Every structure is written in structure tokens, then in C-alpha cells.
Design a protein around this ligand. Structure first.
Ligand SMILES: [Ca+2]
Ligand SMILES: [Ca+2]
Length: 208
């Protein structure tokens, strides 16, 4: 309708409208070096409302993108902030959904255990997220979306692929929802350093 933003040759809508318009403030990819070369697995887009950024992260105004990208307290504040966020992930390298699911599980479980926040309630919820992804095949251009509610720690996961009606999963465990968000939104521990740098630069501009 209004064009698409190309993130590593993958189209992303400039905005996504939930309760209000959210702008693509962060973009990047997840990759791994194999045989001396960069292998791109997914393209990522993080959507936030600039007004929410101004309302909840005003304490970081004046900071440069470089300063924000190197500060985990900033990203913890972004994750803790009661404003919605949408994380859109498009598959570049086709893989079994289980590969993505177990990577998520590994990091989320490890971090929750580190904070002594991994009991049977969290384990059960996390297993449902893993089960959601393992029943799917990630063809290139398949889209995974994470919609984080502003409050009450809720996340709705969506999976869309050509030919099938979109599939969704509602996650309600606050600890799991919070750590899933931090899997992407983490200064030094984010799965996509490129997206982190991008978000930092955008928010710096928003607050400046
Ligand atoms: Ca218990
Ligand atoms: Ca119990």
C-alpha cells in the first residue's frame, strides 16, 4: 500500500498498527559465521511507538546511539517498560522450526535459571513455545511475529507461511514472556547485535 522497507532484501512494513501505529525503529539480522562466511538466518524488525519511547525512556535522552547500544540497563528498561512492542522475524535460510525453537528454549531457560526464575510453571510454558515451533517447517519468507502487551506480561506469537492460514500461540507466563522479549532486546546478550545497534541509533534520534 505505502511501500516496504527492505531489510537485507526482505520486505518489512514501515509500520504495524496494534492499539496504535508502531514504527520500524530497529532492524537487522541473525547470523552465524560458517566456513569463514556470514550465513544469514533471519531478518528482524522491531516495532515501537515513538511516543511510548519518549514517555518511558526519557531518562536516556541526550545519549548517543553508541552509548545506548553499550548499556544493558537501557535495554532492560526498554523490555520492562509497559508499552507494546512487535518483533517481526522473517526466515532467510530455510530450516526446521525445531532448530529455531530449541535455540530460543536454550537461551530462555538458561537465563531464567540464572535468575532463579525457572520452576515448573515456567518450564511448562516454555515447552508450549517449543512445541509450537517444532511442528512447523520454516520455508524462506515464513514470518514469525511476537506481540508483547504493554502490561500483565502477555505475548502472542504468530506464524505465517504461504498457503496456510496464520497460526498463533498465546504465552501468559510473565517470566517466560519477559525473557523471550530479552532474547532479542538485550544489549550484550541479544541474539541480534545488528538489531540492537539499529534500535539504539533510532531511539537516540527519537529522544534527541
Ligand atoms: Ca511451583
Ligand atoms: Ca505446581
Amino acid at each position: 500500500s505505502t511501500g516496504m522497507v527492505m531489510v537485507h532484501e526482505v520486505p518489512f512494513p514501515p509500520q504495524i498498527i496494534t492499539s496504535k501505529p508502531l514504527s520500524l525503529l530497529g532492524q537487522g539480522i541473525t547470523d552465524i559465521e560458517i566456513h569463514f562466511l556470514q550465513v544469514k538466518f533471519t531478518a528482524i524488525g522491531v516495532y515501537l511507538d515513538p511516543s511510548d519511547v519518549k514517555t518511558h525512556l526519557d531518562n536516556w535522552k541526550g545519549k548517543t546511539g553508541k552509548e545506548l547500544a553499550g548499556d544493558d540497563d537501557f535495554f532492560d528498561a526498554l523490555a520492562s517498560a509497559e508499552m507494546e512492542k512487535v518483533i517481526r522475524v522473517v526466515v532467510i535460510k530455510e530450516i526446521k522450526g525445531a532448530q529455531y525453537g530449541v535455540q530460543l528454549e536454550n537461551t530462555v531457560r538458561d537465563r531464567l535459571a540464572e535468575e532463579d526464575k525457572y520452576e515448573e510453571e515456567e518450564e511448562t510454558e516454555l515447552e508450549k513455545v517449543v512445541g509450537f515451533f517444532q511442528s512447523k517447517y520454516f520455508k524462506a519468507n515464513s514470518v514469525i511475529t511476537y506481540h508483547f502487551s504493554a502490561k500483565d506480561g502477555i505475548c502472542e506469537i504468530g506464524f505465517e507461511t504461504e498457503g496456510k492460514e496464520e497460526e498463533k500461540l498465546k504465552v501468559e507466563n510473565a517470566n517466560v514472556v519477559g525473557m523471550m522479549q530479552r532474547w532479542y532486546l538485550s544489549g550484550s546478550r541479544g541474539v541480534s547485535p545488528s538489531t540492537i545497534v539499529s534500535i539504539a541509533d533510532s531511539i537516540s534520534a527519537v529522544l534527541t
